[PDB]
Amino acid sequence: FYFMNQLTYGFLLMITLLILFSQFFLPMILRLYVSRLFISKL
Amino acid sequence: DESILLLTFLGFTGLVAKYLAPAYKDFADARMKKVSDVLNASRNKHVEAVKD
Amino acid sequence: MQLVLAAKYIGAGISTIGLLGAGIGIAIVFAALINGVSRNPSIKDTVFPMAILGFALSEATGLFCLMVSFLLLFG
Amino acid sequence: MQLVLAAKYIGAGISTIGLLGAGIGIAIVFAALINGVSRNPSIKDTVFPMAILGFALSEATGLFCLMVSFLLLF
Amino acid sequence: MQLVLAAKYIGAGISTIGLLGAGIGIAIVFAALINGVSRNPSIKDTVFPMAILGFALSEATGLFCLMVSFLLLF
Amino acid sequence: MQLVLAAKYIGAGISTIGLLGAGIGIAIVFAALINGVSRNPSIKDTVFPMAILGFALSEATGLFCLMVSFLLLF
Amino acid sequence: MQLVLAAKYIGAGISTIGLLGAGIGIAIVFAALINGVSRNPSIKDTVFPMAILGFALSEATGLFCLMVSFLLLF
Amino acid sequence: MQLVLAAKYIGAGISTIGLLGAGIGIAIVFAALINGVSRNPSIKDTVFPMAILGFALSEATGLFCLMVSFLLLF
Amino acid sequence: MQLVLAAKYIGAGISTIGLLGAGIGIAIVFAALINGVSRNPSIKDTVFPMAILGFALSEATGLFCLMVSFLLLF
Amino acid sequence: MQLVLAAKYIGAGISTIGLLGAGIGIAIVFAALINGVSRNPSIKDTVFPMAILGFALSEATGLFCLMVSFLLLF
Amino acid sequence: MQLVLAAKYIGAGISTIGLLGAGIGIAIVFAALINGVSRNPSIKDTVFPMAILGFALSEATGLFCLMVSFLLLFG
Amino acid sequence: SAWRKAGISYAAYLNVAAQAIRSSLKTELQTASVLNRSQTDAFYTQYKNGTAASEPTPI
Amino acid sequence: LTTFSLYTIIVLLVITSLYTLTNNNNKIIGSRWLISQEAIYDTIMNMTKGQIGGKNWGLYFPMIFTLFMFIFIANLISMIPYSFALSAHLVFIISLSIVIWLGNTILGLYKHGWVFFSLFVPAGTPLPLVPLLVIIETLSYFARAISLGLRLGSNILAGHLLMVILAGLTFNFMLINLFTLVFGFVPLAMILAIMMLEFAIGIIQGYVWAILTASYLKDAVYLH
Amino acid sequence: MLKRFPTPILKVYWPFFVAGAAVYYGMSKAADLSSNT
Amino acid sequence: SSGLKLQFALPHETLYSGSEVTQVNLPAKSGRIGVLANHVPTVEQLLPGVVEVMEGSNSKKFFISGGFATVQPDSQLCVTAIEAFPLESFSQENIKNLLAEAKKNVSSSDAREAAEAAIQVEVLENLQSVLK
């Protein structure tokens, strides 16, 4: 029945979270990594 | 029929507030104090290096 | 209808012995527990919550067994 | 309805032999108990309350199995 | 209703082989006793009471099994 | 036709005991987990996911039976 | 109506194999007896009487299986 | 014709439990894995590549019978 | 008449679970590989062809079993 | 006579899994090979023809089962 | 009595896999054979008669089952 | 065999093993270091709490 | 409108509700809501650093992150009793596994091509089982594909429907005669243990998904 | 809000996107061949 | 390490001490154990028998009167024992057998002498395998 429905909105939100977490949520914590490392190393 | 699983959920979350919440509280407090202590100590150390 | 609930009862019968690995499983966990304290005496209070971890989830599989035998007995 | 009580009877028959692995497991419990006390006689009856407790709750599986067979007879 | 006493008989037959678990396991406790005292000849018959206790309760499983078979026989 | 629903029920019953193979398997993982730590106490966190990971691989095999029961149940 | 003695005979057929692994178990007793004495030759008369004690009132319980195969044969 | 799909239902029921020992067997690979690193800590990421290989092959034993259940489902 | 193809389905059901033993078998061909090669890390290239020798010709026998199912399905 | 060919089909189904005796059995020989060379690499080819000799006259016994299947199929 | 030849057929089918009790059993002897010579390389010519002696009187018992199957096929 | 119960300690087990190995010597290769290595000349005397005396026996 | 796509919108709202309200004004100190995300990032980081072990190991580290978190969050919403099954749509999860497997095959053929078919020979073997070792490989090659999907949703679909029908147990136990209230505490603790199992069958199974496709990434990227 | 970074998802994650489009086309074939059950 | 550090040590002359080696072959309590360049840290008591030491060079054949093999966790295997031995020259049949008969005679004496003489018969019969 809703094979197209679930599949298409799942594809959209999968590629959405791909680009979203990639561009946003991994480097927003990698900034914390590099910041704490650069303060500790001076 | 479905509110009984809700009752198990409420009792389980009560046990979570009894058991899991102070443990994660203490883990977060310990890591917080550790990172804050190291971050203060490195700064004080190279302040003393500036004084040297 | 003179046959279906009788077959339900024998289906609850064959779905009762799958907790066989309950009566093995947790027990042989305890067996290594008896080994674990024997070759290492001060690890007992270390391992026994983990072993009771190694109890609990280890037996509940067999629970699934008899709840099939609880459902096809009744519905 | 001549078939259904007889089917309850053979259902209690097939729901009886779950104590096979129960006896196997408690035998492995006592076997490791002998092997543990052979290498540790010094700690014998500290393990043994825990050993017999795990024995109790672990044989209780087959106990519940044949009382399921009992209620399936009834 | 010729089927029902016949099915009692075959239910008795299938409710026999749970003692096979006892029939294995009450031997292996004494087998581990052989092994343990061959390892440790110091403590032979202070765990032989525990060994025959595990024997007794471990073959009581098969006792329960064939008495289920006997009560479904008659 | 009066048998095919009964055939679904007893086919669900014979499909059920596959979780048996989970319920033994996970156990020896925990047993090896004890022999991950009895002989090596300093490595247990190393195997604290790595044992239970194996749990989730064995448990799911048991979980791949009863629901094969359930589609024949429903 | 000649179903019931046929069922008695197949009931003797299913009350039969519940000694089989019992014949394994006493056997591994003897293997353990080898692990008794090929490892520890000094333990032999310490074990082998009591060990064959372990080889008796163990396996006779398994022999109970085939004597059930007589009482429904008659 | 109300009987042939009944028989393929119970044929899917008997072709279910072939996972059983495989659901054991992957675990026993894991058992050796817990005795692999607790014995040898510096092989931890050498065996765990091939062992999880040997996991999947031990899956490849006991999975296809499962889908024999599904194709006989349809 | 309706049973000649219905029985082929249940024969395909029973004639598939032989991989079960493969699900027990080749596992130790990996698992004794583990505690073998954890015991000697640089025996690996010595044994990993031999193990994948001792895998393959020990597995295909079970792969015969469902093959006997396949011809019995078609 | 309409039933005897389907009976032979399910007879080929039940005369199938004696390769189970291979499907674990010969595999454990290779398992004993692995340990048998991991602790002892210089005694590989001392055993390895003879051991693979011990392959054949085991596994062929299991092969007997499925050729029985053919004489109960054709 | 129209079934009794098919009864013999399927009785031969359920008396076929007793070679299972051969097909594993002698194999463990071969396992022990390795456990002879990998443990004791000076025991091989000691054990290689006896172990292959330990072949016959094991697996022939399993052979019994299928030859019973043979006398349950035609006999 | 049952030297652990009846005979020697394991150090003395290997000592008797060394005495048998050096006893199985080539007499050309059995040097003076071998015979002096087996020159068991130590004398043990068990004293008591009152500093009593046992026999100075050849070990 | 579909409740399923609305549930995916609720998932994205929780994704907003994991970092924006977490981060108090971009602070170094790492508050309590951020410690959990730190632990997740580290336990995926140190995992796939050792798993695929490549010089180019981090290049799929966001992907191995974001394929986890979907299963991590969607098994935190169906945990509610009054809810509909999120990831128990086996067509969806198995199709996700099909997408990941086919992307792995296209990556391996674009990276290696004909020598990507050199994965069919794991080790040197003597002759009468050299092609057969390929075949059981190919027999496992789609089994590498099919199982990982057909092993996640069949977990979750087996769980909550359990807590449906065993709720029916409490509809079949606490509806017979009044002495069912006597010693009727053990089905409550049994469903408690099933919920303990359900958090595991969400979280740890999502990690199983992650670790198995991480192994499959090392399979497809690196020819042995 | 969050500092947007040009993290590589087009020059890296192409074949999984290609596989998603191909599975959409396979679902077109399936829902035009097996959705009438 | 590439290879292994063998510390083959005796009370009179420690022959190898961290010598780089590929394989050791030693009669321990569990039987003849061959150990390659890497191994688990493992402690074994050594039965008197033939040790074969294979290196980058060929494999030397020594007899050992028992001892201990201990894998120091830096892959340094220490063989700590008593007796070294040539190819076969130190072994002489007339020396062994004429003493072995007398040792079977002393094995009939009191248990302090009998157990030790039984050990000596065992060692000389193991040395018969060195006579080969």
Swiss-Prot record, chain B:
It comes from Saccharomyces cerevisiae (strain ATCC 204508 / S288c) (Baker's yeast). Belongs to the eukaryotic ATPase B chain family. The chain holds residues 89 to 140 of 244 of the full protein. Present with 12900 molecules/cell in log phase SD medium. It is found in: Mitochondrion; Mitochondrion inner membrane. Mitochondrial membrane ATP synthase (F(1)F(0) ATP synthase or Complex V) produces ATP from ADP in the presence of a proton gradient across the membrane which is generated by electron transport complexes of the respiratory chain. F-type ATPases consist of two structural domains, F(1) - containing the extramembraneous catalytic core, and F(0) - containing the membrane proton channel, linked together by a central stalk and a peripheral stalk. During catalysis, ATP synthesis in the catalytic domain of F(1) is coupled via a rotary mechanism of the central stalk subunits to proton translocation. F-type ATPases have 2 components, CF(1) - the catalytic core - and CF(0) - the membrane proton channel. In yeast, the dimeric form of ATP synthase consists of 17 polypeptides: alpha, beta, gamma, delta, epsilon, 4 (B), 5 (OSCP), 6 (A), 8, 9 (C), d, E (Tim11), f, g, h, i/j and k. The gene is ATP4. This is ATP synthase subunit 4, mitochondrial. It comes from the Eukaryota.
UniProtKB/Swiss-Prot annotation, chains C, K:
The record marks E59 as: Reversibly protonated during proton transport. It is a multi-pass membrane protein. It is found in: Mitochondrion membrane. Keywords: CF(0), Formylation, Hydrogen ion transport, Ion transport, Lipid-binding, Membrane, Mitochondrion, Transmembrane, Transmembrane helix, Transport. GO terms for cellular component: cytosol; mitochondrial inner membrane; mitochondrial intermembrane space; mitochondrion; proton-transporting ATP synthase complex; proton-transporting two-sector ATPase complex, proton-transporting domain. Changing T46L: In strain: DS400/A3 and KL14-4A. Disulfide bonds: none annotated. The modification N-formylmethionine is found at M1. GO terms for molecular function: identical protein binding; lipid binding; proton transmembrane transporter activity. Mitochondrial membrane ATP synthase (F(1)F(0) ATP synthase or Complex V) produces ATP from ADP in the presence of a proton gradient across the membrane which is generated by electron transport complexes of the respiratory chain. F-type ATPases consist of two structural domains, F(1) - containing the extramembraneous catalytic core and F(0) - containing the membrane proton channel, linked together by a central stalk and a peripheral stalk. During catalysis, ATP synthesis in the catalytic domain of F(1) is coupled via a rotary mechanism of the central stalk subunits to proton translocation. This is ATP synthase subunit 9, mitochondrial. The gene is OLI1.
Swiss-Prot record, chain L:
GO terms for biological process: proton motive force-driven ATP synthesis; proton motive force-driven mitochondrial ATP synthesis. Keywords: ATP synthesis, CF(1), Hydrogen ion transport, Ion transport, Membrane, Mitochondrion, Mitochondrion inner membrane, Phosphoprotein, Transport. It is found in: Mitochondrion; Mitochondrion inner membrane. GO terms for cellular component: mitochondrial inner membrane; mitochondrion; proton-transporting ATP synthase complex. The modification Phosphothreonine is found at T51. One of its GO terms (molecular function) is proton-transporting ATP synthase activity, rotational mechanism. InterPro entries: ATP_synth_F1_esu_mt (IPR006721), ATP_synth_F1_esu_sf_mt (IPR036742). Its main location: mitochondrion. Signal peptide: none annotated. F-type ATPases have 2 components, CF(1) - the catalytic core - and CF(0) - the membrane proton channel. CF(1) has five subunits: alpha(3), beta(3), gamma(1), delta(1), epsilon(1). CF(0) has three main subunits: a, b and c. Present with 4280 molecules/cell in log phase SD medium. Belongs to the eukaryotic ATPase epsilon family. This is ATP synthase subunit epsilon, mitochondrial. It comes from Saccharomyces cerevisiae (strain ATCC 204508 / S288c) (Baker's yeast).
UniProtKB/Swiss-Prot annotation, chain M:
InterPro entries: ATP_synth_F0_asu, ATP_synth_F0_asu_AS, ATP_synth_F0_asu_bact/mt, F0_ATP_A_sf. SUPFAM superfamilies: F1F0 ATP synthase subunit A. Changing I136M: In strain: D273-10B/A1. It is a multi-pass membrane protein. The chain crosses the membrane at residues 1-21, 57-77, 90-110, 115-135, 156-176, 181-201. It is found in: Mitochondrion inner membrane. Keywords: ATP synthesis, CF(0), Hydrogen ion transport, Ion transport, Membrane, Mitochondrion, Mitochondrion inner membrane, Transmembrane, Transmembrane helix, Transport. One of its GO terms (biological process) is proton motive force-driven ATP synthesis. It holds the Pfam family ATP-synt_A. Disulfide bonds: none annotated. PROSITE patterns: ATPASE_A (PS00449). Its main location: mitochondrion. One of its GO terms (cellular component) is proton-transporting ATP synthase complex. GO terms for molecular function: proton transmembrane transporter activity. Belongs to the ATPase A chain family. PANTHER family: ATP SYNTHASE SUBUNIT A. F-type ATPases have 2 components, CF(1) - the catalytic core - and CF(0) - the membrane proton channel. In yeast, the dimeric form of ATP synthase consists of 17 polypeptides: alpha, beta, gamma, delta, epsilon, 4 (B), 5 (OSCP), 6 (A), 8, 9 (C), d, E (Tim11), f, g, h, i/j and k. HAMAP family: ATP_synth_a_bact. This is ATP synthase subunit a. It comes from Saccharomyces cerevisiae (strain ATCC 204508 / S288c). The lineage of its organism: Eukaryota, Fungi, Dikarya, Ascomycota, Saccharomycotina.
